[PDB]
Design a protein around this ligand. Structure first.
Ligand SMILES: O=S(=O)(NCCNC/C=C/c1ccc(Br)cc1)c1cccc2cnccc12
Ligand code: NI
Length: 329
């Protein structure tokens, strides 16, 4: 069908309502509103020669795995045996050709002025520039931003239960490893549903939401397969990824590489356990809860999560943890 213009994705009224909501080396995320509902639009420059935010642009061959992975995981919400809504919904994906829209520069500048940006102002693109535009269902606010905003340790327990279940269903269905599930990639949004549902290998179960619905995002480093065909990001030659410091996060890259002996095509669902450990660590060390752990029931949930932190690395997959760990019984 050949690339489409930016107007195909952002008709004039959608485009007028865009406000920037996040960024990364990858590019830019804008929020717009259709039918009274927000959506998140990730715009990623590809195939061009310009350094963009200090890195070279991905080729189509290079951006395809994130595209494939985002579709697969979204489609889990419509499956039967292995079903979950725990990954971000993908409304659409297009390949767009043109220079960056002036109205998006406007929103970008407003962000820079109010929040600050690490990014180059994206105003240097020519009319042949290619982009991948991923429209996601709006997932809420990342766990790092919600650091100080979780009600209780029951909230933290629901979040870890949701994440474990999501990863398990994806493991069973797609032999999925997220491989970069830092706390910027766990989004939280209010839900009025008391219980959330997933189905794992045909068995349906429920999770108390504690008023939040968790969505997993960012598949830039992820791996999965369908019918024996593997899709992944080969970081075996990447130096930088495994020489970070200052946070347990950066240990996880090193620990994954130890587990997989630097063979990123292979399937090692222990990587999901590593990430869930990192996340459990954040829950217990870097969250300021809005309420106090001042009841016997809340004290017990705290001990359970501390037990989880101390034992979870002795399980083989998110599936194993979810099926066998005492925390979820
Ligand atoms: O606007 S976003 O980029 N919000 C998620 C990331 N928020 C910034 C966190 C960055 C970050 C990066 C690394 C670490 Br470690 C911690 C935080 C964003 C990206 C993709 C899909 C989205 C769906 N709904 C809402 C937002 C969506
Ligand atoms: Ni279209």
């Amino acid at each position: 069908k050949g690339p489409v213009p930016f107007s195909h994705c952002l008709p004039t009224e959608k485009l007028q309502r865009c406000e920037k909501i996040g960024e990364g080396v990858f590019g830019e995320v804008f929020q717009t509103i259709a039918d009274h509902t927000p959506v998140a639009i990730k715009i990623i420059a590809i195939e061009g020669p310009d350094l963009v935010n200090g890195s070279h642009q991905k080729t189509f061959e290079e951006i395809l795995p994130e595209i494939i992975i985002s579709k697969e995981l979204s489609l889990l919400s419509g499956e039967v045996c292995n079903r979950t809504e725990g990954f971000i919904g993908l409304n659409s994906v297009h390949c767009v050709q043109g220079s960056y829209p002036p109205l998006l520069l406007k929103a970008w500048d407003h962000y820079n002025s109010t929040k600050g940006s690490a990014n180059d102002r994206p105003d240097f693109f020519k009319d042949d520039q290619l982009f991948i535009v991923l429209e996601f269902e709006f997932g809420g606010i990342d766990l790092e931003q919600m650091r100080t905003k979780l009600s209780s340790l029951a909230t933290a327990k629901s979040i870890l239960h949701q994440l474990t279940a999501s990863l398990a269903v994806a493991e069973a269905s797609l032999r999925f490893e997220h491989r970069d599930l830092h706390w910027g990639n766990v989004l939280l949004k209010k839900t009025s549903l008391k219980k959330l549902h997933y189905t794992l290998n045909g068995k349906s179960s429920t999770i108390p939401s504690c008023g939040l619905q968790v969505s997993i995002i960012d598949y830039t480093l992820s791996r999965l397969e369908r019918d024996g065909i593997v899709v992944f990001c080969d970081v075996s030659m990447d130096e930088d990824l495994f020489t970070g410091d200052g946070d347990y996060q950066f240990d996880i890259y090193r620990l994954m590489k130890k587990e997989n002996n630097n063979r990123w095509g292979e399937y090692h669902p222990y990587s999901n356990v590593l990430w869930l450990h990192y996340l459990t660590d954040k829950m217990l060390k870097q969250m300021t809860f809005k309420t106090k752990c001042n009841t016997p029931a809340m004290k017990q949930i705290k001990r359970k999560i501390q037990e989880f932190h101390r034992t979870m690395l002795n399980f083989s997959s998110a599936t194993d943890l979810l099926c066998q760990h005492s925390l979820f019984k």
